[PDB]
A paper describes a structure:
However, we were unsuccessful in producing full-length selenomethionine (Se-Met) derivatized protein, due to poor protein expression in the methionine auxotrophic bacteria. Instead, Se-Met substituted Rogdi was produced and crystallized using N- and C-terminally truncated constructs (residues 11–276, referred to as tRogdi). The structure of tRogdi was determined by single-wavelength anomalous dispersion (SAD) and refined to 2.04 Å resolution. The structures of full-length and truncated Rogdi are almost identical, with a root mean square deviation (RMSD) of 0.8 Å for all Cα atoms. The N-terminal amino acids 48–55, which correspond to the direct linker between H1 and S1 in all molecules including tRogdi, RogdiH, and RogdiL, were not visible in the electron density map, indicating high flexibility.
Rogdi is the human homolog of Drosophila melanogaster rogdi, and is a predicted leucine zipper protein of unknown function. The human Rogdi protein comprises 287 residues, and is highly conserved among species including fish, fly, frog, worm, and mouse. The crystal structure shows that Rogdi resembles a boomerang with an elongated curved structure comprising two distinct α and β domains. The α domain consists of four helices (H1 to H3, and H6) that form a left-handed four-helix bundle through van der Waals interactions.
Numbering used by the authors: 24 to 46, 57 to 63, 69 to 91, 97 to 129, 139 to 275
Write the structure that this text describes.
């Protein structure tokens, strides 16, 4: 059997192209909310958010917000390459490479489950100039190939309220009516505005992962 080395070469070529995707388009335009986000590798370098009530919020231009899903995916790809560039032996190599690839895909596919207090306390909240008002939260994450911006409008519970208060748990996206404690207040999500844009090089990366995983499984099956 010699096809093992051919497969290892094809994997190295593909994954190096995939790695190049993480290291063209940078500016992305994201109905109630209009965003202009600049994405450089794993760094959200600028975020120009306009909410229709237009309230305008922007990052301070010094600072950048890292998207952990992209950084992690990048490191998984880099490690798949390292495993390659460094019978049952072939199968163990294939399992280790496929493990890195499936982790890279999963990190892009599965954004964090956060509580509303976690969103409010995130450094992302404090990225904005001028500061967000107390009745607005901003969340940003990657959903497979999409850059996703969520803006939550909040409403405090009124005095002598008849409403039942049950604190929301964690969620990727919270629904209107979700409630949480913040400081001396109990707040309800009144509105959820979600805008998203496809990131072409992320889609390219995902396709490369799919191809690579298929090539690994093909080789495993021949042994």
């Amino acid at each position: 059997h010699d096809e093992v080395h051919a497969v290892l070469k094809q994997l190295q070529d593909i994954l190096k192209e995939a790695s190049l995707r993480f290291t063209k388009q940078e500016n992305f335009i994201l109905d109630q909310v209009k965003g202009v986000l600049t994405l450089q590798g794993d760094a959200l370098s600028q975020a120009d958010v306009n909410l229709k009530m237009l309230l305008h919020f922007a990052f301070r231009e010094d600072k950048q917000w890292k998207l952990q899903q992209i950084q992690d995916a990048r490191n998984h790809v880099s490690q798949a390459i390292y495993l390659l560039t460094s019978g049952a032996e072939v199968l163990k190599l294939m399992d280790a490479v496929m493990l890195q690839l499936t982790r890279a895909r999963n990190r892009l596919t599965t954004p964090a489950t956060l509580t509303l207090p976690e969103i409010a306390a995130s450094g992302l909240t404090r990225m904005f100039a001028p500061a967000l008002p107390s009745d607005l939260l901003v969340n940003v994450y990657i959903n497979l190939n999409k850059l996703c911006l969520t803006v939550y409008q909040l409403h405090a519970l009124q005095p002598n309220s008849t409403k039942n208060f049950r604190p929301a748990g964690g969620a990727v996206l919270h629904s209107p009516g979700a409630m949480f404690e913040w400081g001396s207040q109990r707040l309800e999500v009144s509105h959820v505005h979600k805008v998203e844009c496809v990131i072409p090089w992320l889609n390219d990366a995902l396709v490369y992962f799919t191809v690579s995983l298929q090539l690994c499984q093909q080789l495993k099956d021949k042994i």
